[PDB]
């Protein structure tokens, strides 16, 4: 299914404008993309959570039908920017204190992160394919290390700014499925533009976690990872076969999160492409679960 979920709407935020998907009433269910994705990455798994809360599905700024940031460059887009906005988009959103969090690749850094600071309003945190903790390149997936190798450095403008190589070559390549004609047109849409309206997805490359830098996002990643690894609050681990991301030491340490139910799906990186039905199946047998009658 290529069609949207639900319609967007949108909010003035910072000045900016960002794009969200909103539906149903209820304690949220906050479904968050990554790089070089959008809300459209849900559009078949939110369905299975219809009456189970308030589905929102938010575009990060300068992604999806969200605004562009102006003057961009190298310096824009890098983890603290994008969580500056977002922030203040879920607290204008007013999600209450029982938000149950499904996350995605720098979704569920983002994600994670928020959690840790607003652990009290967190009922349960869904994720896969995660930025659970720092890493080395040893642990980064060997098909496509020494291209996101390139994107952090100065080959890195070429590549995506110019070519557009994450969403045409990155994201086609990590799915199992072949993609429709209309299905890569939503995900090509926002950076249709040669030049900085593809930054974002050059900048999230360049802010991963690997071999200590950034240290800032090594820091943030190290606080919640040290964190998720203790708290008690309802985990579901999404695995996948053969995955891509949350493999090997990574995904050693997510199995040992606490209070978590796991769950294998088929798929490399965008699993939500390759599993939809089985993955929103399971998410929402663990919102009925935190949500009882
Ligand atoms: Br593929
Ligand atoms: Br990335």
Redesign the pocket.
């Given at each position: 299914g290529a069609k949207p979920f639900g319609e967007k709407k949108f909010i003035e935020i910072k000045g900016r404008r960002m794009a969200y998907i909103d539906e149903g009433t209820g304690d949220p269910i906050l479904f968050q993309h990554g790089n070089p994705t959008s809300s459209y990455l849900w559009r078949n798994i939110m369905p299975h959570c219809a009456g189970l809360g308030r589905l929102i599905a938010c575009d990060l700024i300068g992604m999806g039908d969200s605004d562009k940031l102006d003057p961009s460059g190298p310096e824009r887009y890098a983890y603290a920017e994008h969580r500056d906005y977002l922030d203040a988009l879920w607290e204008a959103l007013d999600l209450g204190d029982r938000v149950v969090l499904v996350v995605h690749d720098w979704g569920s850094a983002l994600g994670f992160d928020w959690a840790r600071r607003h652990r009290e309003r967190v009922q349960g945190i869904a994720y896969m394919e995660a930025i659970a903790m720092p890493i080395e390149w040893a642990d980064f997936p060997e098909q496509d290390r020494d291209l996101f190798q390139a994107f952090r450095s100065q080959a890195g403008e070429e590549l995506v700014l110019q070519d557009n190589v994450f969403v045409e070559q990155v994201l086609?390549?990590?799915?199992?499925?072949?993609?429709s004609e209309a299905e890569m047109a939503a995900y090509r849409e926002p950076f249709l533009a040669a030049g900085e309206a593809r930054r974002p997805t050059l900048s999230w490359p360049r802010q991963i976690p690997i071999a200590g830098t950034p240290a800032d996002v090594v820091a943030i990643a190290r606080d919640y990872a040290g964190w998720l690894s203790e708290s008690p609050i309802p985990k579901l681990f999404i695995n996948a076969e053969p995955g891509a991301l949350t493999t090997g030491r990574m995904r050693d340490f997510c199995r040992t999160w606490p209070n978590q139910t796991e769950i294998t799906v088929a798929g490399?990186h965008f699993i939500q492409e390759d599993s939809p039905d089985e993955i929103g199946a399971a998410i929402a047998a663990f919102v009925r679960r935190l949500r009882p009658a």
């Amino acid at each position: 299914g290529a069609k949207p979920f639900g319609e967007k709407k949108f909010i003035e935020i910072k000045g900016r404008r960002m794009a969200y998907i909103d539906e149903g009433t209820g304690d949220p269910i906050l479904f968050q993309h990554g790089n070089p994705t959008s809300s459209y990455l849900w559009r078949n798994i939110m369905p299975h959570c219809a009456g189970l809360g308030r589905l929102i599905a938010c575009d990060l700024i300068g992604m999806g039908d969200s605004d562009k940031l102006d003057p961009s460059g190298p310096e824009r887009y890098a983890y603290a920017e994008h969580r500056d906005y977002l922030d203040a988009l879920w607290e204008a959103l007013d999600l209450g204190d029982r938000v149950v969090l499904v996350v995605h690749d720098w979704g569920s850094a983002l994600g994670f992160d928020w959690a840790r600071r607003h652990r009290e309003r967190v009922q349960g945190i869904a994720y896969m394919e995660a930025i659970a903790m720092p890493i080395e390149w040893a642990d980064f997936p060997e098909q496509d290390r020494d291209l996101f190798q390139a994107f952090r450095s100065q080959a890195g403008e070429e590549l995506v700014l110019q070519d557009n190589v994450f969403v045409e070559q990155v994201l086609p390549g990590l799915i199992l499925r072949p993609l429709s004609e209309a299905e890569m047109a939503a995900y090509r849409e926002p950076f249709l533009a040669a030049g900085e309206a593809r930054r974002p997805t050059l900048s999230w490359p360049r802010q991963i976690p690997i071999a200590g830098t950034p240290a800032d996002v090594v820091a943030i990643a190290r606080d919640y990872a040290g964190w998720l690894s203790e708290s008690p609050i309802p985990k579901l681990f999404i695995n996948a076969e053969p995955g891509a991301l949350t493999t090997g030491r990574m995904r050693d340490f997510c199995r040992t999160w606490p209070n978590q139910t796991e769950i294998t799906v088929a798929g490399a990186h965008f699993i939500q492409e390759d599993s939809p039905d089985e993955i929103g199946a399971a998410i929402a047998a663990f919102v009925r679960r935190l949500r009882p009658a």
